Amino acid sequence: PPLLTDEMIAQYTSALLAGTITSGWTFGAGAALQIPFAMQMAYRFNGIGVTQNVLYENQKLIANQFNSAIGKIQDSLSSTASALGKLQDVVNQNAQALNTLVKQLSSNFGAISSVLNDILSRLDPPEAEVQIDRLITGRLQSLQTYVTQQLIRAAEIRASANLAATKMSECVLGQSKRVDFCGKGYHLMSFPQSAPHGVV
Amino acid sequence: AYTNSFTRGVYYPDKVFRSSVLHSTQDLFLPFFSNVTWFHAIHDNPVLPFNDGVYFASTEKSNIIRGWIFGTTLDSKTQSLLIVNNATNVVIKVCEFQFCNDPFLGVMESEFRVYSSANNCTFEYVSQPFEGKQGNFKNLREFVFKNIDGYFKIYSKHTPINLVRDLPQGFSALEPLVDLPIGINITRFQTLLALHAAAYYVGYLQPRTFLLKYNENGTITDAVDCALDPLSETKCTLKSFTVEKGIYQTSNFRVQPTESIVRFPNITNLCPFGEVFNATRFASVYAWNRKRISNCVADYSVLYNSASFSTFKCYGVSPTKLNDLCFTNVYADSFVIRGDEVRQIAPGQTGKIADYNYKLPDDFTGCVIAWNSNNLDSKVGGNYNYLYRLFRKSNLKPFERDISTEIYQAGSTPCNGVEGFNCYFPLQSYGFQPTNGVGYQPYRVVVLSFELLHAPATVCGPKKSTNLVKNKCVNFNFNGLTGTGVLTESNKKFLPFQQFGRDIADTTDAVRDPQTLEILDITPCSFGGVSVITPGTNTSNQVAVLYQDVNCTEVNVFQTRAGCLIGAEHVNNSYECDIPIGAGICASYQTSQSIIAYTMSLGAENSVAYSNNSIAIPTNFTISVTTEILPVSMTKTSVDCTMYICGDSTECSNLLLQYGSFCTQLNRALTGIAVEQDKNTQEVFAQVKQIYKTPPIKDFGGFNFSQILPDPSKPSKRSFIEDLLFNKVTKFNGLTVLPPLLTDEMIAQYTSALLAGTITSGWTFGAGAALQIPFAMQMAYRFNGIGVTQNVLYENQKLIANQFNSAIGKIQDSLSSTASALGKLQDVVNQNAQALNTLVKQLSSNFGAISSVLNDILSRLDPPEAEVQIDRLITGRLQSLQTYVTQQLIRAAEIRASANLAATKMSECVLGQSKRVDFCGKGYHLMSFPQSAPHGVVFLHVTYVPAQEKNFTTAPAICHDGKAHFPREGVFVSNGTHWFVTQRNFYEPQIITTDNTFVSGNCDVVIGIVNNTVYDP
Amino acid sequence: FLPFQQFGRDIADTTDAVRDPQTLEILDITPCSFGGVSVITPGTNTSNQVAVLYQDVNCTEVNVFQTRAGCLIGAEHVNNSYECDIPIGAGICASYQTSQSIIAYTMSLGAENSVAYSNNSI
Amino acid sequence: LVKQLSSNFGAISSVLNDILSRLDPPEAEVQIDRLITGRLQSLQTYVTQQ
C-alpha cells in the first residue's frame, strides 16, 4: 500500500487550496497571512504588468469568466476520458509489465515442461536439475528485465514528480514568471487537485 | 534439572583466519538460550541419547569428571568411542567393550569397572604422562563433540572461574583440538565419574545459521543466533550487530500444508501387461505390433523389480517415479531385434532400423524395455520368420509401419517385375540360431510411449486415494496434477466435458474431483512478506513484526490495511510519522516505553482568520539559513572484464573471445560514466572565469563570514564548515578506481572564488566583470528584489547582521553534531560501495559449476570437460557485470540530473538572486553560499521570513472627491482611526498622498471602497 | 594465526595469507601489481609523439613523472600551470607545447584576480 | 549489435544456416539454443542502453 492514503492527499490539497485562497503566497514563505481574495488577485494582476484597477473595475466580469471556465473544466473531465491518458498509460504500463512477467512462468525456456512440480514428480534429481536450471535461468532473466524496466520507468516518474513539485512551489505556492511553465497566458494562480498516482 | 544456555556453545566452524569481519555461516551450533539438562556428580549418572551432536560442559576444581562413553548398544556388537582422562594418560579408544550397569573409577583406580573386553579394536591413542571436596568451582571446561560423514571433531575451551553458579554468562569461543578419522554410528552416550559438587551440563546442537564477529586478533568475540527472534533475523539481513531505526523486510511467512490429498478415478481394472510382455511370439520390425493400454491400473513396480529384463532405460520419465503420474493413454510397441541393434532404437539415433523400420520422435517421453530371446524366438539352423528392410528410397517419419514390399530401385532401370541389376527386394530376414553370438541372438524389446497429463488421465498407478479435506492448506494431487492450496466449494458452472479451470494468468483456478463431480476452487494458502519494525539498538531491543497482506487468524495485535501488526500498541493519538508502515500508519518508540502504532498526523490543524476587510502584515522579520545538500558526482570506476571474469587464465580468455564485444561495451559504458562525472563537477563548480579572493580586511558591514571563507591557517584551504562536512562523510579482481580530475583543493578554490565574487560584487561577476560593491548595498538590492524597501535593511542592519551570524553558528552546531544531516550524500557513497561488494561476492558463486575458483577447475579437469564448467562461470560473471553496469548507468542518470539541478541553483541563487519560490529554501531568497562536500555541493540559502504579524483593517481603494485612489505600492490599512498605505511584506505605515496612490475612474464600481481623504502635500 | 588456523581471508573472501606447511610462519599474499594502461596523445595531424600512463602503480617494476594518477612516462613535468587540455586526473593535464614535446602540469583554475573591495567604492 | 551476429557464443559456428545444413535436428538445437541465448542477450543489452 502507499504510505499516504487518498484521504491524506485530499487533505493536503485542501490545505494548499485554503492557503492559496486566504493568504496568497504568504503561507509558502512563512506564516499564512490572511488577505481578501480580490486584493490577492490585484497583486496577481500587478505581477503581469496590468494595473490593479483593471481587476476592480472588471471584477464581476472576471469572476463570471472564471466560474464559466471552471464549469467547462468540469464538463470536459466529465465527458472526455482521454483527458487523463497521461496517467492511465502509466497504470497500464505497470499492469502490462506484471502480466508479462506472469506469462513468463508458462514458458519452457527449453525445458520439457514449464511447470516445475511436474518436473520434480517425473524425473529423478540427476536429470531433473538440468531442466530446473533452464527454468531458473529463464525466470531469473525475466525478473531482471522487469526490474530494469521498472528502474527506468521510476526514473521517469521521479523526474515528473520533481517537475510537479517545482510547479507546486512556483505556481500554487507562488506566482510564476516562467513563460508557459504553468499554462499558456500570463500566469495568475494555480490550484492543485489530486488524482490516482498523480496530481492535476 | 534444566538451565538456560547463556550464549554458550560457539566454536570456530573451520580453520580459516578471519578478522574485522562479520561472517555468516550455517553449521551445527547450540541454539541460544536453550534448555540444557543439569546433572550432578554426587548421589549414578544415566546414559543419554546422541543426536546429531552434543554440547558438553563441566565445572571442575578437583578433576572429578574423567571420561565419556559413546556408541549405540554398548554391548560389544559395535564400535564405541571411549575417552578417559585419569590424571596421567589421556586415553582414546575405539575398541568393543562390555560395560557394567554403572561404570566408574575409584580414587589411581581402586575398583574394576573400567571395562571388561578388548576385542575388534580399530584405533588406539595415548597422550603423554602427566580430592573430593565441595565448593565454588575453579575450572570451566566446555566441549563440543560432533560426527560429520567420518570425522569425529572435538572442540573445547578451558577457562578459570571462581564461582558455583550454573553456566556463567559471557561469551567464549571453543577452539578445535581433536579430529578423529573414524565413522562411528553413535546414538547413545555416557560420562565417567570418579567416586571415593562437580556438576556438568548436556545441551544439544541444531542446524542453525549464526553470525560471528571476528575482532582484530581473529578471535570470535560475539555472535547472533539468526533464528532466535525477529531482531536477530534483522541483524542477519543487514550483516550488522547495530540496527538503525526503521522498518526492514526480513523474511516471508508461508502457511504449510497439514496433510496430503491423493485423488484418483475409482477404476478397478488392471492393465494387461502380462499379455504383452508374456506373449508366445513378438512381431517383426517391419510390422511391429502396437497395443494401446488404457482405462486400467498400471502397476509398474512389478515389471521394474522383476529380474528378467536385459535393459530398462527411460527417457522423459524417471524409472522409479512412475507410480505417481498418469497418462491419457500408453502405447506398447512390441518387436524382435538383433542384440547389436539395441543401440539404434532411441530418439535422435540413426541406422538401418532407425531410418527404415522404426523411427522414434525426438521428444519421446517413454521407456525402452528389453530381454534376450535365445530360448524362445531362435530356432535350430536359423529361424527365418523375422523380416527387416535395409533399402528404402525415403526416410520414415517417427512411428511409421512401412509394410509395402515394393521392388527397391537402386537405379533408374525398370523394376517392379525385375529382380536384376539395381532392382532388388528390400525385405531380408534373420536366421536366429542358438549358437550365434551374443549380438546376434534375438531380443524382445517393447517400448512404452507415455505422454504427459496435457488432458484427462485414465491410466494411474496402484495407489489408493484418500478423502478430501476442504478449507485447509493441503498438498493435493488430482489425476496426477499436483499442487498446494486450500480447496473450497465454488459456484463456477463447468460444462460436463470441462475438467480444469484457468485464471487470466493461466494458473490453475479450480478442478473437478474425479470421483464426486463437484467443482473445487483452489486458492493458494496465505503467504506474505514479514517486516520488522524496530527503534535503533542504541535505544531498545523491543521490536514489532508486520505480516504483510494477511489476516492474523493463522499465525497486542492490531489489524491494519498494511497487514496485521503484532507487538505494537494501538494509540488513538496521532503524531508525526517516524517509522512508516503504510496506509497512513506509522510506528515509534514512546511512552514504561513501548512500541506504538498510530495514524499519522499531517500537521497541526490551523484556520486562517479570513474576512473580506482584514489583512495581516508582518511587523518584524527573521533571517534564516537553511542547508541544501546535493550529490554532484559518484566514485568513478573501471572494470577489466577479462581479469574479473578470467583472471590470469588464457583458456578462459579464449573462451571469452567467443562473446565478441561484450567486454568493450562495458568498458566503454563505464568510461562514459567516468567522463560525465568530471563533466558534472566542471559544470557545477567551474562557472566563474577567474579566481577571486577576498581582501585581508573583512569589513563586510557586520556580517561575519569567517566560518565559510577559507581559513589561511589550515593545511588545506577549506572553510571551517567544509572541514566539518569532510569529517562526516566516510581491488585486485580487475576492479579499479580512477581519481577525479578535480582534486578537493581545486574544488575548494572554486568555491572560494564564488564566495569572494558573491560577497564583493554581488551578481555582476556572473554576467560579466566582477564590479566591486559594498556588501550592505548588495543586501539593499537583495531586499528590493523581494519587495522590501532598502531602508529597512539600513535601519535594521545591526539586527540583520546579528541574526545572520547566529544562524550561521546554528548551522555549524548542527553539522558538528547531527551526522544524518548529510545522509543524502552518504547513501550515494554506500550505494556505490555496496554495488562493488556485491560484484565481488559474485566471484564466490558457482553458477552451477563444481567450484567457483577457476584455477582449481583448470588444475583438476582436462580441457574437454573443463570448458563446460568454465563457460558456466563466464556466463554467470558476465551477467553479474552487466547487472552492475546497468545499475551504474541508471544511478549515473540520477546523479547527472542532480548535478544539473545543482548547477542550476548555483547559477540562479549564488550567481544571481532567485524569484523561484522554494527553489532555494523556504522564504524570500536573498543570497546563497556554496560549500564543497565529498562528491557533492552544499548550499547555504539565506532567506527573509516574515514574523510577528498584526491584524490590520484594510481596503482595496479610497474615494476622495469622487475619484478612486489605488496604491502604487502597498495596500491601504487602518489601525482603527487613521488610514495609511504600506508595503506588503513589512509594516511601515505612510501617510496616504497623491504621490503614493494613483487615480482611475470614480467611486461607484469597486467593491469595498471606503470614504476617506487623500492628503495633497 | 591460532595454531589450528591455516588460511586467512579478507572481507571479500579472497585468500589473504597462508601458513607454510613446512615452516610455520604466516605469509601475506598480495597479488602482483597491475593496472590499466592509457595513451595520451595529440592528434595525428600534429605529432606522433605519445605519453603512456600506467594507472595506479609505482614506476619501479616497469622522462618519468610520478603522479597520483599513476606513473606517467614520456611527458615532461612543467612547473608552469596552464588550462587543461588532455586530462589525466588528480589535477594533472597534458598538452603538446614548447622543440615541441609532450608536457604534464598541474592545471590552472583561471587567472588570479582580486576585487578592489572597499566599503565606499562601487 | 551487428557484430554480435558473427560471434559463436560457444557454438561450432556463428552462421545458423551452416549449422542447419550440417547437423541433424537432435544435435543442432543445442548449438542453435546457444546462438539464440547469445543473440537475445545482445538485443536486451542494446535495448536497455537505448
Ligand SMILES: *[C@@H]1O[C@H](CO)[C@@H](O[C@@H]2O[C@H](CO)[C@@H](O)[C@H](O)[C@H]2NC(C)=O)[C@H](O)[C@H]1NC(C)=O
Ligand atoms: C545406528 O545404530 C542404531 C542403533 O541404536 C540403528 O538403529 C537400529 O536400526 C535398525 C534398522 O536396521 C532397527 O532394526 C533397530 O531396531 C534400530 N535400533 C534401535 C535401538 O532402534 C541405526 O540404524 C544405526 N545406523 C547406521 C547408519 O548404522
Ligand SMILES: *[C@@H]1O[C@H](CO)[C@@H](O[C@@H]2O[C@H](CO)[C@@H](O)[C@H](O)[C@H]2NC(C)=O)[C@H](O)[C@H]1NC(C)=O
Ligand atoms: C524583531 O525581532 C528581534 C528578534 O527576532 C528583536 O530583537 C530582540 O529584541 C529584544 C527586545 O525586547 C531583545 O531583548 C533581544 O535580545 C533582541 N534579539 C536580537 C537577536 O537582537 C527586535 O527587537 C524585534 N523588533 C521589533 C520592532 O519588534
Ligand SMILES: *[C@@H]1O[C@H](CO)[C@@H](O[C@@H]2O[C@H](CO)[C@@H](O)[C@H](O)[C@H]2NC(C)=O)[C@H](O)[C@H]1NC(C)=O
Ligand atoms: C566571527 O565569528 C567567530 C566565531 O565563529 C569569531 O571568532 C571568535 O572570536 C572571539 C572574540 O570575540 C574569540 O574569543 C573566539 O575564540 C573566536 N573563535 C574562533 C573559532 O576563532 C570572530 O572573531 C568573528 N569575527 C568578528 C570580526 O568579530
Ligand SMILES: *[C@@H]1O[C@H](CO)[C@@H](O[C@@H]2O[C@H](CO)[C@@H](O)[C@H](O)[C@H]2NC(C)=O)[C@H](O)[C@H]1NC(C)=O
Ligand atoms: C493610529 O495611528 C495614528 C498615527 O500615529 C495614531 O494617532 C496618533 O496617536 C498618538 C497617541 O494616541 C498621538 O499622540 C498622535 O498625535 C496621533 N497622531 C496624529 C497625527 O494625530 C492613532 O492613535 C492610532 N490609532 C490606534 C488605535 O492605535
Ligand SMILES: *[C@@H]1O[C@H](CO)[C@@H](O[C@@H]2O[C@H](CO)[C@@H](O)[C@H](O)[C@H]2NC(C)=O)[C@H](O)[C@H]1NC(C)=O
Ligand atoms: C462617501 O461620501 C459620498 C458623498 O459624500 C456618499 O455618497 C452619498 O451617499 C448617500 C447615502 O448612500 C446618498 O444618499 C447620497 O446621494 C450620496 N451622494 C453622492 C454624491 O454619491 C457615500 O455614501 C459615502 N460613503 C460612506 C461609506 O460614507
Ligand SMILES: *[C@@H]1O[C@H](CO)[C@@H](O)[C@H](O)[C@H]1NC(C)=O
Ligand atoms: C525449559 O524447560 C522448562 C521445564 O521443562 C520449560 O517450562 C521451559 O519452557 C523450557 N524452556 C524452553 C525455552 O523451552
Ligand SMILES: *[C@@H]1O[C@H](CO)[C@@H](O)[C@H](O)[C@H]1NC(C)=O
Ligand atoms: C590411565 O589409563 C590407561 C589406559 O590403559 C592406563 O594404561 C594408564 O596406566 C592409566 N594411568 C594411571 C592409572 O595412572
Ligand SMILES: *[C@@H]1O[C@H](CO)[C@@H](O)[C@H](O)[C@H]1NC(C)=O
Ligand atoms: C569381533 O568380536 C566377536 C565377539 O564374539 C568375535 O566373535 C569376532 O570374531 C570378532 N571379529 C570380527 C571380525 O567380528
Ligand SMILES: *[C@@H]1O[C@H](CO)[C@@H](O)[C@H](O)[C@H]1NC(C)=O
Ligand atoms: C591481541 O590484540 C591485543 C591488542 O591490544 C594485543 O595486545 C595482543 O597481544 C594480541 N594477541 C593476543 C593473543 O591477545
Ligand SMILES: *[C@@H]1O[C@H](CO)[C@@H](O)[C@H](O)[C@H]1NC(C)=O
Ligand atoms: C467409486 O466411484 C464412483 C464414481 O463416481 C463413486 O460414486 C463411488 O462413491 C466410488 N466408491 C468409493 C467406495 O469411493
Ligand SMILES: *[C@@H]1O[C@H](CO)[C@@H](O)[C@H](O)[C@H]1NC(C)=O
Ligand atoms: C511374465 O512371466 C514371468 C515369468 O513367468 C513373471 O515373472 C512376470 O511377472 C510375468 N509378467 C507379468 C506382468 O506378470
Ligand SMILES: *[C@@H]1O[C@H](CO)[C@@H](O)[C@H](O)[C@H]1NC(C)=O
Ligand atoms: C548511542 O550510543 C553511544 C555509545 O553506545 C552513546 O554514547 C550515545 O549516547 C547513544 N545515543 C543515544 C541517543 O542514546
Ligand SMILES: *[C@@H]1O[C@H](CO)[C@@H](O)[C@H](O)[C@H]1NC(C)=O
Ligand atoms: C479476518 O479474521 C476475522 C476473524 O474471524 C474475520 O472476521 C475477518 O472477516 C477476516 N478478514 C478480514 C479482516 O479481511
Ligand SMILES: *[C@@H]1O[C@H](CO)[C@@H](O)[C@H](O)[C@H]1NC(C)=O
Ligand atoms: C480509543 O477510541 C475508542 C473509540 O472507539 C475507544 O473505545 C478506546 O477506548 C480508545 N482508547 C484509548 C486508549 O483512549
Ligand SMILES: *[C@@H]1O[C@H](CO)[C@@H](O)[C@H](O)[C@H]1NC(C)=O
Ligand atoms: C486576528 O483576529 C482573529 C479574530 O479576531 C484572531 O483569531 C487572530 O488571532 C488575530 N491575529 C492576530 C495576529 O492577532
Ligand SMILES: *[C@@H]1O[C@H](CO)[C@@H](O)[C@H](O)[C@H]1NC(C)=O
Ligand atoms: C464584506 O464587505 C461588505 C461591504 O463591502 C460588508 O457589508 C460585508 O458585511 C462584508 N462581509 C462580512 C462577512 O462582514
